[PDB]
Amino acid sequence: GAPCGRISFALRYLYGSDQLVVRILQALDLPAKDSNGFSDPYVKIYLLPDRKKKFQTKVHRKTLNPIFNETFQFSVPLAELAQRKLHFSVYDFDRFSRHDLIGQVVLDNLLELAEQPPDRPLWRDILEGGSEKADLGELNFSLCYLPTAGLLTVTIIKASNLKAMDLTGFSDPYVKASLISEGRRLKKRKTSIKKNTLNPTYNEALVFDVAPESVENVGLSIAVVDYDCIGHNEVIGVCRVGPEAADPHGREHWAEMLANPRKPVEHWHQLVEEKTLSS
Ligand SMILES: [Ca+2]
Ligand SMILES: [Ca+2]
Ligand SMILES: [Ca+2]
Ligand SMILES: [Ca+2]
Ligand SMILES: [Ca+2]
Ligand SMILES: [Ca+2]
Ligand SMILES: [Zn+2]
Numbered sequence: 001g002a003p004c005g006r007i008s009f010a011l012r013y014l015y016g017s018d019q020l021v022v023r024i025l026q027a028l029d030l031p032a033k034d035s036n037g038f039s040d041p042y043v044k045i046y047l048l049p050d051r052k053k054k055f056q057t058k059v060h061r062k063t064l065n066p067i068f069n070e071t072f073q074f075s076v077p078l079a080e081l082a083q084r085k086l087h088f089s090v091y092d093f094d095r096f097s098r099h100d101l102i103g104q105v106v107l108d109n110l111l112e113l114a115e116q117p118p119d120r121p122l123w124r125d126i127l128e129g130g131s132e133k134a135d136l137g138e139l140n141f142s143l144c145y146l147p148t149a150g151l152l153t154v155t156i157i158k159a160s161n162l163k164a165m166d167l168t169g170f171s172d173p174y175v176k177a178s179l180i181s182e183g184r185r186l187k188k189r190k191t192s193i194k195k196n197t198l199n200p201t202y203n204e205a206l207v208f209d210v211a212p213e214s215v216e217n218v219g220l221s222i223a224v225v226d227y228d229c230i231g232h233n234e235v236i237g238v239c240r241v242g243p244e245a246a247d248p249h250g251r252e253h254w255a256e257m258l259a260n261p262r263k264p265v266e267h268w269h270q271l272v273e274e275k276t277l278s279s
Helices: 110-115 248-255
Strands: 006-014 019-028 041-048 050-056 067-074 085-092 100-107 122-125 138-141 144-146 151-153 156-160 173-181 184-190 201-204 207-209 219-226 234-241 267-270
Touching: 006 085, 006 110, 019 041, 019 085, 019 110, 041 067, 100 122, 100 138, 100 267, 138 219, 156 173, 184 207, 234 248, 234 267, 248 267
Parallel strands: none
Antiparallel strands: 006 019, 006 122, 019 067, 041 050, 041 085, 085 100, 138 156, 138 267, 144 151, 151 207, 156 201, 173 184, 173 219, 219 234
């Protein structure tokens, strides 16, 4: 996707000193946030679930393609790397105004990313999507279409930094994928109701019958929902995927679902407030 800004880096994990190292290299095609058509980008870094534990890059002014070249060390036992996530928040720095969020990226299982290779840099697209003091969360899922059989399969993988929705302290999240074509909702499908977490893992496949002469014109709206009871469930966040999707990243994902027929494509998406789209 063209209008989709992205950032590159590299990371290795020195055992024997239990240290996750992370080099932020450079970003490209960042969104402008200044009236001058640019941004003064810098990136906050977290290592979930540790919410405070942040590093910050220098604040490169006037550029949509910063070259950070900064490195950061984290003390994590090998046993913990799996139960852990990196999380970058890209921001535009501002003098006279609240700093503008450019986007966020979530780094899934850190172990595998680091274990190899070294200085073949890896890229992730910066997830544009509203984030007030309270972020709704990111949702990870695959996407695989068998044209020969008309099976389109979603497969909800996991979610990160969901919004707490219960007084108890968390949310009892499940995921509602629903087929959309030309504004009409055609078919819904739910997942398990994993309870009392904000970083759920599903690995559950949702499947839809869709003719090959029709995929191009269909799409789906996924939405993480906090269970509550009987019929009073309250939504946490939503995300579109398919043509006619607001976010380029949203339709680039459906775009590459086709073009790679029997291959599942994994991608992170930013959960966004329900009232910024409309079926
Ligand atoms: Ca600005
Ligand atoms: Ca600025
Ligand atoms: Ca501002
Ligand atoms: Ca609730
Ligand atoms: Ca509960
Ligand atoms: Ca609940
Ligand atoms: Zn993208």
